[PDB]
Subunit: 281 residues, 2 copies
């Protein structure tokens, strides 16, 4: 495929010069398919996002992660157990109310800057329910938060009675324990990417929240209408600062490497029945 | 014209049985062209609104007023003096902020019912500036208020510094004295109607405000997208209770007919200084 070939050329010929060592702090981008780690400057991050976006629109297999580090956008990872194997409705009013409640906790952290600011919420959903297991990500990529503040906001969100109600009425049986408390620290999948055993989450709905310190009781939340007009890998990225839709608002602060060849014996080192080993160890 | 003929037949053959006497309190509808006053029950009000709406869509001359009485929707009448003879921009953000400020005064009146409620704001604008004179109506037809509460809300709105700022930045030179303090009591033009010397105000933008007593800091004002889908005479009526878009929320409690021929006589009669006439009376 042309756009995959283009991404391959960008990675090997050009971005190879930004390859980081394992466990490097500078790393911002992880390609879990090639097992490569990169520290991309903003210019080269954007070029990557243009290629990943073209690959996304053609349904190409991607497994890119961004590292959140100490100061970046907020991601909420919800792992739902459902009543049934039916995708829950999750219509705009429920998602709109979720945004409001998420914002109340952000505001209560006291780190928002004074003045008038737009922040965008994006809901990406697991494409199907598998054995009653369902998922969504809430991405607030533009709202640049300290890791410690994200952890605090996530702690508060787990105990939110209104959020638990919304999730319950959607058919969620684990509304108390569905929000991953490590949402603040885990590397976050780029839009169009997934674990190799899963399919990528799909953008259902995005919302624009405006807050004004002078008028704190007015918190307008509206659906974003022309989402398709933007580079979604770009806009949804927690570490991006050069989005068009998403403009930053700054808040107060495995080594065996088989390389697709040697792992085959791994596939037959599991179904030995060799638990008990008197001579067989 | 067919729809005017239809309205004429409805008025003379059918609604004539609801004709009220001059100064009757039962009056809810005034046809200032025919000089007739009516007390229409809800069923016949709707039939009227269907005919007026058809007449409106074809640009027919209407001069219908509704009487606000003691308990009905809120109307704000703004008479603007402008910097220039250019229509002020009045884009959604300015009008959105106006709605929020108007709501703060409604909330402060203490009369809103507990629970979750949608209220709709409609802004109808004077079609052109004439000698720097401009106007808009703010209609909140669904929010059923006592006359005394409307007067109180209007009093507070006149002194609102944020509203005065918004109007100032639009080029208004009378931001302190542009809101008619009798907005609560005056008979209110039906959408598509006007004084015989003026043209009807045009609906520019409508907004949906949701309030929730349990979550008072969340006040999302969603603009309304499919306005054309509704009967606008119906929805915008302060006294209507059977709108489709606008569902009521209950708060705690001469004849000219110039035919464009004698307007010329008026235009040539005023300029002489013969208002007093000792030899030429």
């Amino acid at each position: 495929l042309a756009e995959v070939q283009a991404l391959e050329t960008l990675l090997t010929r050009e971005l190879s010069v930004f390859l980081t060592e394992p466990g490097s702090k500078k790393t911002n981008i992880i390609n879990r398919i090639t097992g490569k780690t990169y520290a991309l400057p903003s210019t080269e991050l954007l070029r990557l996002y243009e290629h990943l976006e073209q690959c996304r629109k053609q349904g190409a297999l991607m497994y890119f992660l961004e590292r959140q580090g100490t100061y970046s956008g907020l991601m909420l990872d919800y792992d739902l157990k459902l009543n049934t194997n039916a995708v829950p409705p999750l219509e705009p009013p429920a998602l709109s109310r979720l945004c409001h409640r998420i914002f109340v906790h952000i505001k209560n952290s006291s780190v928002l800057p004074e003045g008038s600011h737009k922040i965008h919420f994006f809901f990406t959903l697991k494409p199907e329910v598998v054995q009653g297991k369902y998922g969504f990500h809430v991405l607030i990529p533009g709202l640049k938060l300290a890791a410690s503040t994200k952890k605090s906001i996530i702690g508060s969100l787990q105990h939110d009675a209104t959020v638990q109600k919304i999730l319950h009425e959607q058919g969620v049986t684990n509304p108390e324990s569905c929000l991953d408390p490590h949402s603040a620290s885990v590397p976050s999948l780029l839009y169009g990417s997934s674990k190799l055993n899963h399919k990528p989450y799909q953008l259902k709905t995005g919302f624009e929240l405006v807050f004004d310190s002078s008028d704190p009781d007015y918190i307008p939340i509206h659906q974003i209408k022309n989402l398709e007009s933007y580079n979604l890998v770009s806009e949804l990225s927690l570490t991006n600062e050069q989005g068009s839709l998403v403009r930053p608002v700054y808040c107060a602060a495995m080594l065996h490497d088989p390389e697709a060849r040697y792992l085959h014996k791994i596939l037959n080192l599991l179904p030995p029945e060799y638990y008990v080993e008197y001579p067989l160890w």
